[PDB]
Design a binder for this molecule. Structure first.
Ligand SMILES: Cc1cc2nc3c(=O)[nH]c(=O)nc-3n(C[C@H](O)[C@H](O)[C@H](O)COP(=O)(O)OP(=O)(O)OC[C@H]3O[C@@H](n4cnc5c(N)ncnc54)[C@H](O)[C@@H]3O)c2cc1C
Ligand SMILES: Cc1cc2nc3c(=O)[nH]c(=O)nc-3n(C[C@H](O)[C@H](O)[C@H](O)COP(=O)(O)OP(=O)(O)OC[C@H]3O[C@@H](n4cnc5c(N)ncnc54)[C@H](O)[C@@H]3O)c2cc1C
Ligand SMILES: [Cl-]
Ligand SMILES: [Cl-]
Ligand SMILES: [Cl-]
Ligand SMILES: [Cl-]
Ligand SMILES: [Cl-]
Ligand SMILES: [Cl-]
Ligand SMILES: [Mg+2]
Ligand SMILES: [Mg+2]
Lengths: 469, 469
């Protein structure tokens, strides 16, 4: 007998299950994934997404760093080699450890992991079809839909798991492709392209839109594109793929650019133009759940669906398709079910791109602030002259703040540089506390540290950074 | 002619000068240092302190990582070697670039750098004795004393800057010593010891006191001692040096620990038992400035001396001997001179140790909180299970929070691990905003990041971390 049934065992689903167990609910988490013959919790994030991509980014970064960034330190290595199979096996081991860890967490919280598929029926009943055995009809009072996402498909570039792959296949190439095409220049394509480029592939990253990273602050995307291009990442803009032709162990990409039909041949092609909500087999025709024209489950600000007691979260519903967004939505849904007015602040959700250097941002871009009626003032300071960055040999990028000129209210923070993914949390925290730019100016930041650039950027908003020319 | 005269061109002094110039004052900064044959600003921090030590820590960390932490990633190399002269030259070039940078900042701000010594005479008069030129007596309205510090000297281990060196010589060894003795297990000794150990030295560190890092939280110092010892730093607690003996190119350290007289021989010995205020040639006998006990210029909370119009900042006065403390006291002194009730919060000053892994803390330790009357609750979470840390091969250490059990007020943060120097700024900001533990619990931290360990530790304070087994 379960009070709450969660359909989906990804970041959203398992976080919700754990929080519910902490609050006294009798919980079931239904998750169908079987990864290399083992049922596995963790969703996209752990099994074929965030974690594996971060592992390959770290290993490939170490390789590039060893070949190209040791000479200035007076360090020599002679030959430098990588064994791709060992590099990939390390990633697989990390994934195994982490998915085993979540399984242990559910067991420790007294949560039952139902291995199989779940479907929401009328009256909030849930059909559980196990991998092996008798189908069960559960009758919970509450249900959290957390079915996540899958890759967007491009009909003219069909994935075959061999020459043309999606992000899953891109994390598993058995050899480094000599020529690699990547369709999509969002966070996923930039990261996957960087991994293989560092390991020796000649990479072309296609972006069909006329703009690079459209949701990022324009100053950030402009500088970031410049930085990635400088590293050898060939980002091709205004290129719309119109067809593909697989001939043996090669694939030719036909694309339109500047009104002309062009072509380029690659050894492997990655299709990563985004992800879409996945809800196949999620809802019975009489579930009573309202859908949107774009394929999402409709919810309000608190993730509540049209059916009382049924919440929907993560990549399945509106908002940035990020792991932490799914996790906090899971917690919010459970707390709401339990009567607490929990709320995710969608204006303080962090975005990170794990390239090197990293890019990260939170809050409003300069354009968004202007669009929303703010009289805007901005300020930025670079890592180029930062003592810590020079010592580390990582003097590139900057910290930019967006603020209100009338109230001095901090509205957004945009960063490219060392420790960007952890530095952006400083801005996120300041935003949660409704910080003014002055609040940050009055604080003592450690010296020498990458973080003091944050302080200098705060001073620069009012044109008074100490170390500015 | 000058409104303000600052005696000392270290972080405290030049920071004060620039702020003063921004506020419209005509400023003179008197700095005597002659480094590598020419006059140079930046003080201890830039010339023989923070910056050069950070450069060597980074290069030595690269060497160690290349020898020992590439195999797990499937990366192999030929025989790894380092050219010590070139490694040191890199550090020297970074210091030269930075010192030149400060010089051009003073000129850009319309500040006159007087190259020579300064002395506060009666009636706020200041005697400038240039290195080359006529001596002049200036009559400013305000004076800031920022003469800084120098190492503590111990007649038992006299510095010849060859066999027995202080922190300055320790940053310039012409060859890696096979056996290195380090007197002092403070931040500086742990860092200098780590540099040379990484480069091949067999290192022993003597600490006179019965405790390791007594100002740190006990849980942090305990784990940190274990980590550093396992790396190869033989940290000898309660080891009091009674004498040194130099025999040719070797030095025997005689010392007492646990009741027994012992000795060991080394190729080099570093003396870094702390730093003391430096005020030689700073004050005329009739300057009118008050003193305390050991050797500090007495000042109130705003760095005001007993003489109206005269302030004293940085290592010259009470408080943590840190660059950022000097920097903030310099800005405070200048804003007080200008009429504003500026204030430095000494309970939010960050301490960082730049070993690998890094250690960092801010606020109250668990013992300090109890001493001040708080009913204390604590929470901690480790990087060992953090996905980002596993991906990076940095899975060690933890984040620990100290908080009041009755009011939920956050009191301190203590970190060992990846990005510690930057993660600790998150705690610093939360303390500046008078954060409760619940405030941090309700925030969305990015996933996967080292920073989400902060969130888990906040939740662990109330025994509800989602990922705690
Ligand atoms: C290559 C790549 C890299 C990424 N990198 C990052 C990053 O750096 N940072 C970041 O924040 N995000 C990243 N993401 C996105 C992140 O993985 C998702 O935002 C996150 O996994 C969404 O979590 P979720 O719980 O909503 O859905 P999912 O993680 O997709 O989990 C849903 C789970 O439910 C299961 N399921 C679906 N339907 C049913 C059913 N009817 N019955 C039983 N089980 C079902 C699925 O098997 C799936 O495992 C990345 C994604 C990819 C593909
Ligand atoms: C090896 C080492 C590593 C360190 N690492 C760190 C770290 O990681 N983080 C950190 O926060 N701190 C660190 N410190 C400490 C830091 O360098 C000091 O706290 C900081 O430099 C203090 O700045 P200041 O302006 O008070 O004095 P100083 O930096 O000492 O500057 C004072 C300057 O004034 C000059 N002077 C003195 N008397 C006169 C006079 N009468 N006339 C003219 N000039 C005069 C001196 O020559 C000196 O150049 C380190 C120190 C050392 C030795
Ligand atoms: Cl994808
Ligand atoms: Cl695939
Ligand atoms: Cl913008
Ligand atoms: Cl201490
Ligand atoms: Cl303690
Ligand atoms: Cl005294
Ligand atoms: Mg066009
Ligand atoms: Mg306020």
């Amino acid at each position: 007998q379960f009070d709450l049934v969660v359909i989906g065992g990804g970041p959203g689903g398992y976080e919700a299950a754990i929080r519910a167990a902490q609050l006294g609910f009798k919980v079931a988490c239904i998750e169908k994934r079987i990864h290399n013959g083992k049922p596995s919790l963790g969703g996209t994030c752990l099994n074929v997404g965030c974690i594996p991509s971060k592992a390959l980014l770290d290993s490939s970064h170490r390789y590039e760093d060893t070949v190209h960034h040791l000479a200035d330190h007076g360090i020599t290595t002679g030959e430098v080699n990588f064994d791709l199979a060992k590099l990939l096996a390390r990633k697989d081991k990390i994934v195994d450890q982490l998915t085993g860890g979540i399984d242990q967490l559910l067991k420790g919280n007294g949560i039952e992991w139902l291995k199989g598929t779940g479907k929401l029926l009328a009256g909030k009943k849930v059909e559980f079809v196990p991998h092996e055995g008798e189908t069960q009809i559960l009758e919970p009072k509450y249900v959290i839909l957390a079915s996540g996402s899958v890759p967007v498909n491009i009909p003219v570039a069909p994935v075959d798991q061999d020459i043309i792959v999606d992000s899953t296949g891109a994390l598993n190439f058995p050899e480094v492709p000599k020529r690699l095409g990547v369709i999509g220049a969002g966070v996923i394509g930039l990261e996957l392209g960087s991994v293989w480029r560092r390991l020796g592939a000649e990479v072309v990253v296609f972006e069909a839109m006329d703009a690079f990273l459209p949701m990022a602050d324009k100053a950030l995307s402009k500088e970031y594109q410049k930085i990635l291009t400088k590293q050898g990442l060939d980002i091709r803009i205004g290129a719309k793929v119109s067809g593909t032709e697989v001939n043996g162990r090669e694939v030719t990409v036909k694309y339109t650019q500047a009104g002309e039909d062009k072509e380029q041949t690659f050894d492997k092609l990655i299709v990563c133009v985004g992800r879409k909500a996945y809800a196949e087999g999620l809802l019975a025709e009489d579930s009573g759940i309202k859908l949107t024209e774009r394929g999402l489950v409709e919810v309000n600000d608190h993730c509540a669906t049209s059916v009382e007691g049924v919440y929907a979260i993560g990549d399945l519903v509106r908002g940035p398709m990020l792991a932490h967004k799914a996790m906090e939505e899971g917690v919010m849904a459970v707390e709401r079910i339990h009567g607490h007015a929990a709320q995710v602040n969608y204006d303080t959700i962090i975005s990170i791109i794990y390239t090197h250097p990293e890019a990260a941002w939170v809050g409003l871009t300069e354009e968004q602030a202007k669009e929303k009626g703010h009289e805007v003032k901005t300020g930025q300071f670079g890592f180029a002259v930062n003592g810590r960055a020079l010592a580390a040999g990582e003097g590139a990028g900057f910290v930019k703040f967006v603020a209100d000129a009338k109230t001095d209210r901090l509205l957004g923070m945009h960063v490219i540089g060392p420790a960007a993914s952890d530095i952006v949390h400083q801005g996120m925290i300041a935003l949660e506390f409704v910080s003014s730019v002055e609040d940050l100016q009055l604080m003592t930041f450690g010296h020498p540290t990458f973080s003091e650039v944050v302080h200098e950027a705060a001073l620069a908003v009012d044109g008074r950074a100490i170390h500015a020319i």
